[PDB]
Design a protein around this ligand. Structure first.
Ligand SMILES: CC(C)C[C@H](NP(=O)(O)O[C@@H]1O[C@@H](C)[C@H](O)[C@@H](O)[C@H]1O)C(=O)N[C@@H](Cc1c[nH]c2ccccc12)C(=O)O
Ligand SMILES: CC(C)C[C@H](NP(=O)(O)O[C@@H]1O[C@@H](C)[C@H](O)[C@@H](O)[C@H]1O)C(=O)N[C@@H](Cc1c[nH]c2ccccc12)C(=O)O
Ligand SMILES: *[C@@H]1O[C@H](CO)[C@@H](O[C@@H]2O[C@H](CO)[C@@H](O)[C@H](O)[C@H]2NC(C)=O)[C@H](O)[C@H]1NC(C)=O
Ligand SMILES: *[C@@H]1O[C@H](CO)[C@@H](O[C@@H]2O[C@H](CO)[C@@H](O)[C@H](O)[C@H]2NC(C)=O)[C@H](O)[C@H]1NC(C)=O
Ligand SMILES: *[C@@H]1O[C@H](CO)[C@@H](O[C@@H]2O[C@H](CO)[C@@H](O)[C@H](O)[C@H]2NC(C)=O)[C@H](O)[C@H]1NC(C)=O
Ligand SMILES: *[C@@H]1O[C@H](CO)[C@@H](O[C@@H]2O[C@H](CO)[C@@H](O)[C@H](O)[C@H]2NC(C)=O)[C@H](O)[C@H]1NC(C)=O
Ligand SMILES: *[C@@H]1O[C@H](CO)[C@@H](O)[C@H](O)[C@H]1NC(C)=O
Ligand SMILES: *[C@@H]1O[C@H](CO)[C@@H](O)[C@H](O)[C@H]1NC(C)=O
Ligand SMILES: [Zn+2]
Ligand SMILES: [Zn+2]
Lengths: 696, 696
């Protein structure tokens, strides 16, 4: 009754190596399952986080490097353009020789950076307006400042596109950082120093005098301004309810209630919106319907902006533009971000150039790179098998509904209806391999050159926005993939009600038709359950089978959902993270992911149980004395083996909607009776609390 | 009859994961044994070379990190200093904030760097001399330029120390690079650009004007000068006969034979040698016996040094000094080496700081670190077993002499006599664990600062040189170990006639109590044979049982040795390496290592056969359809699994005395009748040529 395949041996050794059998399973199963892993793996200097996931992603990047660096030869134009772009990216010699000249060239096109202009007020200050300035940064360079304007899906009509207005993101990772005290104080000092440093560098390249106190004054003025804007933004905790975020109104109505005063003149929303949309030849009338996500912010925005001069506003806007471009210039400009970056991620060095370039090319040509990846590392025989894993888990979810006691019959039936309506995406879209002509034409208007890297990335910003802005009047192109194939991740789309599993994640330890079923359900199986459950988490449940923000819940069932999930808010909220200095996790912002973890793990387990009942039990793995019930949970946990840098630990608590792998394991298994039955944990042992949370 | 232990499981899996069972063993055993290894273990972005050996040192560095990173209250002074040194090394924030100041402050000590000095002739020209300049770099920093001077063992009198004179190494890996054409072209450009880049950095920090053209003129002269010096050096092929290299003469005779004119003045050897030896208060009279290794080089030096100014000479000498320190300064100085590092190693970044620091501390406090390593990771239970393996292989060597028909009777008796006299070193010197007082005394004169890494490394350079120079009138201490314990390697000393196996190499795949005997003999068994055979290769055979360079060979047997060994020169010289662009191995420079490889595996296999004969067969490994004769050779080969970046393949093929692992596997097994019997290789298959080489 012992497995003797080549595969089972490699598999077993892997389980054995990562675990620490000297640890007690019921005190800390993370340490039990990943103790060996942690003792073996050190976080790379360039990584803010290291884990199984990060390793699989690092291995994928290598594959990308291999295909991108390859001599052209019998390549379609789409692939050639990808390789050219990559070549331009890795050539630091050409980039270093250009200094900061590529940035200094286009600064007038964004109405300049006052601190880096000897006299900004007469060069730009006469033809200047916040409307044209914000619009230019938005529509040409994808930089969203002061007001986030983007064309997106109508929440309540998933077949249409519509203008969205929201609060913008900030220079720092979150609004909390702008307290600038304690664990943020380090971020703020490096941040302001980052400003001053780049200001001096640019002025030195233009051949201008350096008043370092004055540069420091203006940048502290910028920081003063951004602190207010950050303070005016709504907390993420008050933005987890999609129904509350949706405010549809006309442009004229926006003009009426969210007026702004810049330089003693009224801000014109019509002028602003049309400055953006004229780039794609679309007129925006006063009767245009618009969705406003952050009405409270725009209100608070009025007293702030009216206190500042055009110079102060432009100083901030151009800075937000430049800070994301300095790392695309010479080595001297790259180094200006080191202290800032080190404060936020704990990384003493930026990632290897070829890594960033592979990701950059993949992020901007996801179909072209996806094509190369699946031909190099993805087997086609994987589809119908993942198909087989998904059908089981989908069915488990529907069956589980009858067991769940916090829903009434009508809500269960509607939940079932949505579950049956979930559409799936696996591996890659076929036509990126079988249809050369379509793929070529996707990137047809891009025309890259190796000696102009900066021109290439500026071109991409313009291409990305232009492509997106044009969608306003188009109906949504569903089946459009929402991710490249060369991605180590999985996704749920509430708007499309679909689950997506790209080729990058369909590999060990998540998945292999050549590894055991016990291992598969605990890996990709849990992941499939995770993505499905997202359709029914605190966010997804608000969308119907068609992807529309519509309430299909009874008041009683909805309140029960909130009651059931509140258990998880406290549980994960009570977790103290030593890597983040004892600071607690956001039980509210991670709720959806925790619901997804807890539901997914149970679904994968139920489905595995159904499999065993259908074909019988599997032969044991050699060299490790655990049954397959135990092995399921062991593989689940080893999927989430990992560790964090302290700087990034603090960051991710406020910016990552996921819990760290450590607590995804502890939290989920604590609520699992089946786990405690498998490892015979005593009652009220740390892994077996008497109080257990349960949603799906 | 199949092993089922957890130890056997990960042992088998390792073998399985590394091999490629689809490859034909008799066509290419490297591909067969290491094919899977190649796919699984992609070269890390910070590695120029990657291999099993390299993997083991990295895992060892992790252990060193754990035992160095945390202060403990009971830490003896020696350990505190090692930890203080490590802490100073890894504090990059403190290092970055000091820029190049530690170097700039230090540069006067070596008579400065003319190109980066305001007025070099004024400041240093008055007191400058070549004797003192070379001597200072030598006696304080161990940096050997123009003429190599060192205190070492007398080749012909192994109890004494004596002064040696030899040709120095170069800034580039070998004399071949200075052709600067073809495969050496990029290296030369980056090398000179490196000079220019550092000159600019230092001058900028000193607040001096930057004249690009003037700097370029001076630095190309440095290259021009070093080209001539490189061309004057004697080829490595002509330096493998220890008898021909040994030229004993008095200092007076050296002045007579090897006069030199520099800046119009005659070079004084008495002054030069006494400028060095006065640092440890030893006077060197004219009657002092000296060993001169490169008389031809010193003669060729005569017309070269006369053509150059003190500025030219010092620009080169101080550059040789600066290039090895720049990576120990702030990031900007680190990055100046980037293009140069890539040219020689292909690496895109410097290896992890903590890895470098762990290695650095290990290199400078090998006993203190060796102590921490063996207490944390080395099973002392291993020693007696290794003792027994050594005895077996020693006895096999002696017995094998009867089979060798190319030696007459009395040379065989002499060979046996030396074999019997070989002394062994296993694990670590006992004193480093059992004697705190002795360990503390070793580092008594050392005193490190937490925040001055550069100051600490300068102290170490001076201390290291001083300690060695002081030995000139002392007898050689034989019990003194020639390696630290925390080392993944093994050694043979011609001068001591001893074989050394530090704890670091006493681990899988070489050796483990939880490892099959076939693997142990194929691993550490072959390694033991390798080191023993080194005592009888083209170099070792020239030294007697007490380590003295004396001829104990009959003329015929010596001639026959040259004939037998000549086969291997041709064999390995005919090997072309695709990673090195088709360059051929150097059959002459690798002869010694190739002789040891071929001898050792034969000795190890015979010893293994004897062991199985007396103790019986072992249980087979799961998932591997091979018998133990085959597992012997599989494990032997996987010891040498690895791959090279093209730039370093070119590098190593011109500098490494070893063959690449690729050809150590192919070469040794081509000559192994026993290998071909085990895998039933047809005559004249690639792995089984009908013409085979045989020495030992
Ligand atoms: C396997 C499955 C659980 C994947 C799962 N993705 P999911 O949470 O559905 O999706 C997440 O939120 C969406 C809003 C974003 O669009 C996605 O990019 C992702 O961040 C996840 O936990 N992703 C985490 C963990 C992770 C995935 N790939 C990784 C690679 C390296 C390190 C961590 C990861 C993340 O994206 O962070
Ligand atoms: C038989 C083998 C187990 C040990 C064997 N050391 P050995 O050749 O006796 O000795 C080596 O070369 C001599 C010329 C030098 O004098 C020694 O200092 C030592 O560097 C060797 O092949 N060393 C190689 C392989 C190697 C040892 N440690 C490594 C670490 C990383 C990569 C490769 C290696 C090398 O030094 O390269
Ligand atoms: C990377 O960029 C460098 C700098 O632009 C390129 O080097 C130049 O190459 C052109 C091509 O003929 C020459 O005309 C120039 O003289 C080169 N200048 C320098 C300073 O080297 C280099 O070719 C680029 N790499 C690749 C692979 O195209
Ligand atoms: C937004 O407002 C600006 C002015 O604030 C408009 O720019 C003017 O355009 C007209 C006609 O194109 C010119 O005659 C003026 O000289 C421009 N004035 C300035 C100050 O630039 C711009 O056209 C408006 N955009 C939209 C879409 O209405
Ligand atoms: C390397 O050094 C040798 C001598 O050590 C140089 O050989 C001399 O070359 C000149 C010019 O052709 C001849 O006139 C001499 O007769 C040669 N001398 C000997 C002893 O051969 C050789 O040119 C040098 N090569 C380089 C590249 O510098
Ligand atoms: C050092 O120089 C002396 C003198 O030239 C060399 O000794 C001579 O060697 C040649 C041939 O080797 C003989 O013909 C002479 O009779 C020797 N003269 C004396 C006085 O011994 C000696 O070989 C040189 N040594 C080195 C290492 O170059
Ligand atoms: C944030 O804004 C509110 C008003 O919207 C104000 O009362 C409060 O003082 C502000 N806080 C900071 C830190 O500026
Ligand atoms: C590193 O050095 C800096 C400055 O000398 C000091 O502030 C810091 O505490 C040091 N960090 C460590 C870990 O020693
Ligand atoms: Zn998720
Ligand atoms: Zn050797």
């Amino acid at each position: 009754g012992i497995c003797k395949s080549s595969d089972c041996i490699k598999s077993a050794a892997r389980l054995i190596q990562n675990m620490d059998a000297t640890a007690e399973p019921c005190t800390d199963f993370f340490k039990y399952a990943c103790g060996g892993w942690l003792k073996r793996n050190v976080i790379p200097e360039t990584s803010s986080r290291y884990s199984n996931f990060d390793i699989l992603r690092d291995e994928l990047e290598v594959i990308l490097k291999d295909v991108l660096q390859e001599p052209k030869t019998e390549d379609i134009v789409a692939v050639q353009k990808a390789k050219t772009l990559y070549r331009s990216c890795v050539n630091e010699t050409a980039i270093d020789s250009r200094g900061g000249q590529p940035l200094l060239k286009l600064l007038p096109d964004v109405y300049g950076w006052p601190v880096a202009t000897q006299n900004w007020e007469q060069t730009y200050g006469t033809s200047w307006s916040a409307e044209k300035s914000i619009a230019q940064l938005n529509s040409k360079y994808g930089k969203k400042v002061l007001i986030n304007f983007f064309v997106g899906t109508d929440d309540k009509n998933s077949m249409n596109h519509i203008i969205h207005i929201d609060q913008p993101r900030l220079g720092l990772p979150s609004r909390d950082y702008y307290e600038c005290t304690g664990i943020y104080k380090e971020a703020c000092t490096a941040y302001v120093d980052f400003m001053i440093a780049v200001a001096k560098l640019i002025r030195q390249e233009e051949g201008l005098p350096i008043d370092e106190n004055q540069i420091s004054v203006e940048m502290n003025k910028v920081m003063e301004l951004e602190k207010e804007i950050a303070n005016a933004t709504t907390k993420s905790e008050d933005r987890n309810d999609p129904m509350l975020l949706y405010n549809k109104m006309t442009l004229a109505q926006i003009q009426n209630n969210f007026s702004l005063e810049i330089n003693g003149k009224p801000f014109s929303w019509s002028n602003f919106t049309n400055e953006i949309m004229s780039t794609v030849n679309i007129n925006i009338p006063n009767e245009e319907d618009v969705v406003v996500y952050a009405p409270e912010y725009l209100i608070k925005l009025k007293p702030i902006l009216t206190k500042y001069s055009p110079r102060d506003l432009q100083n901030l806007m151009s800075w937000r533009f430049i800070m994301d471009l300095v790392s695309s210039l010479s080595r001297t400009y790259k180094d200006s971000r080191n202290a800032f970056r080190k404060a936020l991620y704990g990384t003493t060095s930026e990632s290897a150039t070829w890594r960033r370039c592979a990701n950059y090319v993949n992020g901007n040509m996801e179909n072209a790179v996806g094509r190369l990846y699946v031909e190099a590392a993805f087997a086609g025989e994987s589809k119908h098998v993942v198909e087989d894993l998904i059908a089981q888990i989908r069915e488990v979810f529907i069956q589980t509904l009858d067991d769940l006691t916090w829903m009434d019959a009508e809500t269960k039936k509607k939940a079932e209806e949505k579950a049956l309506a979930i559409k799936e995406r696996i591996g890659y879209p076929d036509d990126i391999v079988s249809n050369d002509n379509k793929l070529n034409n996707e990137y047809l208007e891009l025309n890259y050159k190796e000696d102009e890297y900066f021109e290439n990335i500026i071109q991409n910003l313009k291409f990305s926005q232009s492509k997106q802005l044009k969608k306003l009047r188009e109906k949504v192109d569903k089946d459009e993939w929402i991710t490249g194939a060369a991605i180590v991740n999985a996704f749920y789309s509430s708007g499309r009600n679909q689950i997506v599993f790209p080729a990058g994640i369909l590999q060990p330890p998540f998945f292999s038709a050549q590894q055991s079923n016990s291992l598969n359900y605990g890996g990709i199986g849990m992941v499939i359950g995770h993505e499905i459950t997202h359709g029914f988490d605190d966010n997804g449940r608000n969308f119907n089978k068609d992807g529309d923000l519509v309430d299909w819940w009874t008041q009683q069932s909805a309140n029960n959902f909130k009651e059931q999930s509140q258990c998880m808010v406290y549980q994960y909220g009570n977790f103290s993270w030593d890597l983040a200095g004892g600071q607690h996790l956001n039980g509210i912002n991670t709720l959806g992911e925790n619901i997804a973890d807890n539901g997914g793990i149970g679904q994968a387990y139920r489905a595995y149980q159904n499999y065993v009942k259908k074909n019988g039990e599997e032969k044991l793995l050699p060299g490790i004395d655990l049954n397959h019930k135990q092995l399921f949970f062991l593989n689940f946990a080893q999927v989430w083996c990992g560790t964090y840098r302290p700087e990034y630990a603090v960051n991710s608590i406020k910016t990552d909607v996921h819990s760290p792998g450590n607590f995804r394991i502890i939290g989920s298994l604590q609520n699992s009776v089946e786990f405690s039955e498998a490892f015979q944990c005593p009652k009220n042992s740390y892994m077996n609390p008497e109080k257990k949370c349960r949603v799906w």
